Ligand binder design. Structure first.
Ligand SMILES: CC(C)(COP(=O)(O)OP(=O)(O)OC[C@H]1O[C@@H](n2cnc3c(N)ncnc32)[C@H](O)[C@@H]1OP(=O)(O)O)[C@@H](O)C(=O)NCCC(=O)NCCS
Ligand SMILES: CC(C)(COP(=O)(O)OP(=O)(O)OC[C@H]1O[C@@H](n2cnc3c(N)ncnc32)[C@H](O)[C@@H]1OP(=O)(O)O)[C@@H](O)C(=O)NCCC(=O)NCCS
Ligand SMILES: CC(C)(COP(=O)(O)OP(=O)(O)OC[C@H]1O[C@@H](n2cnc3c(N)ncnc32)[C@H](O)[C@@H]1OP(=O)(O)O)[C@@H](O)C(=O)NCCC(=O)NCCS
Ligand SMILES: *C(=O)CCCC[C@@H]1SC[C@@H]2NC(=O)N[C@@H]21
Ligand SMILES: *C(=O)CCCC[C@@H]1SC[C@@H]2NC(=O)N[C@@H]21
Lengths: 506, 213, 506, 166, 213
């Protein structure tokens, strides 16, 4: 009984006191400290605490550390069952091995079988070189289980240290990737190989740091100051998400009122059509208590995605941001919104869309980058959704951008419009230029026809007369209309035709 | 100039208000659906640590009917009564005997409180959470290279400052028109404008020089 | 009876004799000529021949052309039922309108209901400006039906003319896009708006020509010299593809023999490890009669995708190309192979994979472009596949690239290896450097340990001893082993867990 | 904001004050009054309030009345979600047209999708003669929706006026 | 130098062989599974058009049991007998009375035939297909520049050409080593080497100048 506790303490020591104090010196928590902070007090049950590797090459048999560089188990976050694994950087550098991957596979299998969220905490150095192809096989098993669990249970990856080589492909298939600034980085190939091949000198932070993956490469869904903040925000996020694709969104007691009006929204849209406004202000006015968990805030800032609550239930939000790039749709924003909409649809999360978009970003850079398929990704995600879709057009909706941004034609349930909405094929000037192309040399006649087109078509009423807009609502009633619409649409039933899977462009 | 850090009774009142807000939020949070078992079969930790901008308070929060009772290390107790709800910018109520109003702003894993001319970031942890948070390093900002670069291509609309003028943080510096939409640039540092490179009406390019701090 | 035939002739005239002659002057066929060339002789039945628009704005009521700029209907290609629509460039420029989109919607609904392939021929000018938001609504309906039909029936888009604005988003979500060189182009935004906004002067060909979309942007799956060649190749591809996701691949009588050996394959792999070889030669020696329909041949040429036949049945092929970029995996190749594998799995097409890959492409360009998620796309597609998967490793399989390229660990059914295969975590030099970094200064010791590592681990037998490789086969029996394996695996049954859809990264 | 209220008031007037007065003279409520009486207080959300017909034959384009002779939407009856449409006898006699039937089809689709009861209030004069075979096509779409919803959601029809033809 | 275009009996034999190959391929193709109705309930068009590298032959193909009979406009009939199967590089058989062997190289919508020193691209259409194909324009090659660029970054290892040497297409010009793999560059045009920019052992970036034509 005392020898068992002694063995437990020795296993908890991990790679030794020196490596633990080095980890703390870097400003990072240990794997067990991260697990303790993530879960409720006393709820953690650990699996495979005494697992050791069976490698006998290059003198590996002389160092057998229990746990083999990963801590696995399950617990509760706010009373709800979750599974998690945390790679121990002090044990062989956290490198993946056969038994390491076997423990991760066991925890993944249990999470999928019990229909519970699984959390991955990554602080490692890749795959163990001495293990050979067995580590690659274990990585492949982990990847296969990640693919199998996709769309069934939420998978969250927290990068709290180095992540290189084949390690990065496990978080990449999870739903959300979060990084810690200045201490974590991700790349398929390390700086040394980059120097030896491309003759380029970069550091780990420059190559794959948190800023790179949160603002450039679209890999990460967010970054945090340190480990404690990241783990607390993970706990906050878990309260938004369903446990699986069956139970639906969790519900809490809301302190907000669903019948309240916000008169400040009546003056949110500027009189000048060239003046931008903050759509995040509208989003935080609509959600309960102004609490909004934003996803990929630093990437593709011309669109906004994130989780809020309406009447105590999780609601996804997609909105164009006029403050960045005039709110146009480009490849980055399209891909970000498409991934968010696909996640929300997969887990039965209703989506509220605020539309203010003048079109797509022009130029050869967008066309050579595949803007066609990238925009088609968002169009595909919106047309594929069977969750409730509430769309509110605030200022602009022009042409294909109007079609893509959750219009009634692609399957939106309710489509509201503010009195300042402008739903048309294009602007009045370009429209009269295309239509009255013969009398282009005149000036007064062109101005008169432009004014006539502006008064006749750049309004929410041409679409309202065709039934494309369900109702033109006052801006101060936005939250009330959204709440009532979602309450009514909670019972929506809809299914796509039978298929193994769709062929959405990649 | 710089917001003073709360001291004495002001600090105690801010700590009590932060503890009460955290207690209310935790009580609401514990009512989430889909839990493995009944949340009534769990216990709330009385001992709490309140950090007010590098100042720790070891407090215990105990419900008393509708209101809370926050007890500090040195025997002092402060009942907290309020009708404040999350999302309300102002916290109004009584902390002990005095009636106070405190500005509440959202913060990551905490709240930002302003009261009696003092401002502090309030984070409430358990003892173990406070111990783990004490291990996190203090990270200092680097700053900008005393130059205002244009992040997007466009045409300069207006510049409201001239060379040799003092500008505080967040003050607008220039307006850039791109795709029929104005963009406002704000200073990320403080100082005096050494010189102005771009003039109003000029069609700048990506990462073009506008002014030097 | 004579007035009906006169009306039919007037409708067949389209936009007039002068416009048809102008169309023929550019070297392009008319919509009806394209339909006649695509279908079997006398099999075309036309729908909505006399449909006219109902617009009354800007004097549109004075121009009522029957058909409204599109020819719709159904026919047979090699005796198999297909549906098709061909936009008529001589009628309002082929621009989409309400009745135009209604006809396309009818043909799409019939194609989905009959479970038959649908072919889209695009020669148009976007959406009709005078129609207003009704054209946008019709476009949205077409987009929704395109998304609904995805993964159920094969959708083929042939771009034989201009395609701009919201038009491009309908082909984008189809399975295959084919273009005609020098006469077709695709872009979301036209050159005039590009000049107005970005102050860049480009032509239609420079902005969205066939070469751009076949070699630079990944939009198109191929390009052809002219219209007749494109249509004949479309007929060939239709002969390759299944009618829907239920009937399976079509079967023909094969003139080739499944038991023949190819002794020339025994010397395909060069003795020098730095000498590349043509994997296309191996692919064309394995398929029946050397007939191989390649997909995206001009894009991401470090990997090869396309359709062949083994024993008269359609088989998909994915193979690394050592001739381009040493056969490494980058974002472009990963996305191309992932889309191909997703299409093949969606329609129950078995996939044969030839593996020769030293790893992933390094550098900041790949990492900043999202190499993590783009590479994970191919791994997701392979792990998600439930169709038969036969993998043959020829020369190299290093690190995570070995896992991605349809390894045993991600769900491959049979994994063969040539005697020249090298399955390891990395090269011998780097492995010795990592393992023996302490004594890296001794040149002779480093060389001796590198030789030992090369002899021990850079062989197909370490994986064979672990069961990761089913069999090491002689190169001359590759086709025989593949044919027997596919014949055995035809009865494979496997299913992913229940979900709305997966959350593959975009 | 004031022009939106003015347009809403003009749309609520239907086919004019005198036609509403004649409707009250017959002892009949208006379509909107019937909807208000049926649903709970303040629960009615209206769809397609400004929908207008697109017919241009026999001078129909000179009289475009918003709503096109039917009031559609959803509400709650005793707290339970219901969908409803009420034909407006003062607007073209309540006759079915293309946009009229389109609004009815929208409300039927929403009722079937949300699995909620749908209530039909009929006070009309058949199909609009000037709306050719488009009116018949809309009638057929409504019939198909009715057949599809049969046995899935309860369908209640209240005949509060003339109902002839199709 | 340049392969002669077939003429006279050689052209007739090539046309007959192309027609026989097309007939065999069509017969195999018509037996595909999943057809709407029985393939036997359909007719095959006897009239065919064989376009032999800008030379048209109007032929009719009628199967003579195990053989094929091709009749031309001038009334000449050339029976065709062979055991050739698709994928075989050589077509061996008898065209009428003479026994011939023809090299078969497939191309898009046709085959490339070499026989008796003559080479021609053979495409077989119907009447309507030939009429539609006649509408297609003849597109000329745009050529290439006189500079040989380096498509990928790497190290130059070997150059087999020297100054003032005339080479034609399909000839190696340089070898570039990148990522432990060689890359052979081939000439896309013809021209004497006027100036060599890079030599062996020189590291070149992307699109670097190598040769001048
Ligand atoms: C991930 C990485 C950038 C971080 O390394 P780091 O943060 O500087 O920490 P270190 O380099 O000091 O390695 C720390 C320890 O972990 C061990 N380790 C890390 N990764 C390992 C792996 N994949 N296999 C075996 N051991 C490993 C090291 O041996 C070292 O042991 P030590 O403390 O006694 O020296 C670097 O280790 C790396 O690139 N590893 C290889 C991963 C990879 O595949 N990169 C792509 C190259 S193609
Ligand atoms: C597609 C496009 C590049 C090709 O134009 P083109 O090949 O040079 O042929 P044209 O410009 O001469 O237009 C041909 C005819 O079709 C008509 N047409 C083309 N597109 C049309 C549209 N979208 N709506 C209505 N009519 C259209 C033109 O009026 C013209 O009539 P005409 O023969 O009497 O002159 C160009 O027509 C276009 O961009 N159209 C708009 C589509 C779009 O949205 N582009 C993106 C801009 S943001
Ligand atoms: C239903 C019906 C018996 C009731 O008519 P009613 O109660 O006496 O009221 P009215 O006849 O005065 O018609 C009222 C108004 O609606 C209009 N209206 C009624 N039905 C209409 C229809 N089907 N189409 C167009 N307009 C119609 C009339 O023009 C009239 O306009 P008005 O007020 O300026 O005169 C009669 O209108 C009718 O039969 N309509 C045709 C419906 C039908 O198909 N009947 C079967 C014939 S086979
Ligand atoms: C004035 O310059 C009008 C041209 C700008 C129009 C803007 S640019 C981005 C949007 N895309 C598009 O086609 N039009 C919008
Ligand atoms: C000699 O230079 C060895 C370094 C090159 C290794 C090649 S480059 C592309 C592949 N990716 C990787 O990590 N190694 C392979």
């Amino acid at each position: 009984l005392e020898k068992l506790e002694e063995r437990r303490a020795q296993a908890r020591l991990g790679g030794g006191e020196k490596r633990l104090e080095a980890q703390h010196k870097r400003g990072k928590l240990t794997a067990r400290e991260r697990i303790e902070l993530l879960l409720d007090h006393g709820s953690f049950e650990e699996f495979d605490m005494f697992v050791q590797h069976r490698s006998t090459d290059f003198g590996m048999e002389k160092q057998k550390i229990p746990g083999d560089g990963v801590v696995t188990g399950w617990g509760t976050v706010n009373g709800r069952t979750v599974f998690l694994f945390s790679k121990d950087f002090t044990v062989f550098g956290g490198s993946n091995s056969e038994a390491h991957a076997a423990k991760i596979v066991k925890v993944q299998d249990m999470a999928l079988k019990m229909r519970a969220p699984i959390i991955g905490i990554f602080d490692a150095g890749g795959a163990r070189i001495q293990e050979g192809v067995a580590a690659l096989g274990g990585h492949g098993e982990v990847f296969r289980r990640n693919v199998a669990a996709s769309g069934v249970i939420p998978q969250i990856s927290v990068i709290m240290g180095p992540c290189a080589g084949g390690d990065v492909y496990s978080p990449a298939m999870t739903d959300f990737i979060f990084m810690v600034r200045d201490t974590s980085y991700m790349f398929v190939t390390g700086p040394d190989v980059v120097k030896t091949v491309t003759n380029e000198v970069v550091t780990a932070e420059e190559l794959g740091g948190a800023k790179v993956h949160t603002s450039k490469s679209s890999i990460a869904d967010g970054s945090f100051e340190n480990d404690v903040e990241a783990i607390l925000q993970i706990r906050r996020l878990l309260d938004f998400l369903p446990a699986n694709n069956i139970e639906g969104v969790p519900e809490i007691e809301s302190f907000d009122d669903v019948n309240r009006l916000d008169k400040s929204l009546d003056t949110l849209i500027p009189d000048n059509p060239n003046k931008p406004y903050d759509m995040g202000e509208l989003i935080r006015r609509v959600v309960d208590e102004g609490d909004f968990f934003e996803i990929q805030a630093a990437y593709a800032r011309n669109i906004i995605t994130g989780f809020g609550r309406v009447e105590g239930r999780t609601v996804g939000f997609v909105a164009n941001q006029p403050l960045v790039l005039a709110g146009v749709l480009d490849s980055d924003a399209s891909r970000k919104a498409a991934r968010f909409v696909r996640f929300c649809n997969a887990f039965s999360i209703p989506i509220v869309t605020f539309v203010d978009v003048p079109g797509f970003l022009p130029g050869t850079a967008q066309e050579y980058g595949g803007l066609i398929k990238h925009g088609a990704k968002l169009l595909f995600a919106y047309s594929q959704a069977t969750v409730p879709l509430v769309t509110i057009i605030t200022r602009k909706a022009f042409g294909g951008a109007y079609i893509v941004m959750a219009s009634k034609h692609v399957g939106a349930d309710l489509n509201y419009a503010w009195p300042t909405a402008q739903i048309a094929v294009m602007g009045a000037k370009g429209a009269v230029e295309i239509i009255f192309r013969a009398e282009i040399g005149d000036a007064d006649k062109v101005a008169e026809r432009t004014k006539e087109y502006e008064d006749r078509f750049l309004s929410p009423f041409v679409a309202a007369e065709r039934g494309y807009i369900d109702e033109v609502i006052m801006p101060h009633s936005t939250r009330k209309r959204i709440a009532r619409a979602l309450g009514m649409l909670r019972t929506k039933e809809m299914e796509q035709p039978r298929k193994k899977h769709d062929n959405i462009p990649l | 100039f710089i917001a003073p850090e709360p001291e004495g009774p002001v600090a105690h009142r801010l700590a009590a208000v932060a503890a009460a807000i955290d207690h209310k939020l935790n009580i609401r949070k514990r009512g989430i659906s889909g839990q493995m078992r009944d949340p009534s079969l769990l216990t709330f930790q009385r001992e709490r640590v309140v950090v007010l901008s590098g100042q720790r308070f070891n407090v215990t929060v105990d419900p008393d009917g509708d209101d809370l009772l926050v007890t500090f290390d040195d025997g002092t107790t402060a009942p907290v009564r309020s009708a404040w709800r999350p999302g309300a910018p102002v916290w109004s109520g009584t902390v002990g005997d005095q009636s106070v109003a405190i500005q509440v702003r959202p913060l990551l894993n905490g709240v930002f409180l302003q009261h009696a001319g003092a401002a502090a970031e309030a984070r409430v942890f358990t003892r173990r959470e406070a111990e783990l948070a004490d291990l996190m390093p203090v990270k200092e900002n680097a700053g900008s290279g005393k130059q205002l670069l244009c992040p997007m291509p466009g045409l300069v609309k207006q510049i409201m400052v001239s060379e040799g003028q003092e500008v505080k943080n967040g003050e607008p510096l220039a307006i850039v028109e791109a795709m029929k939409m104005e963009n406002v640039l704000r200073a990320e540092r403080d100082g005096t404008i050494s010189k102005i490179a771009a003039k109003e009406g000029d069609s700048l390019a990506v990462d073009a020089v506008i002014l030097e701090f």
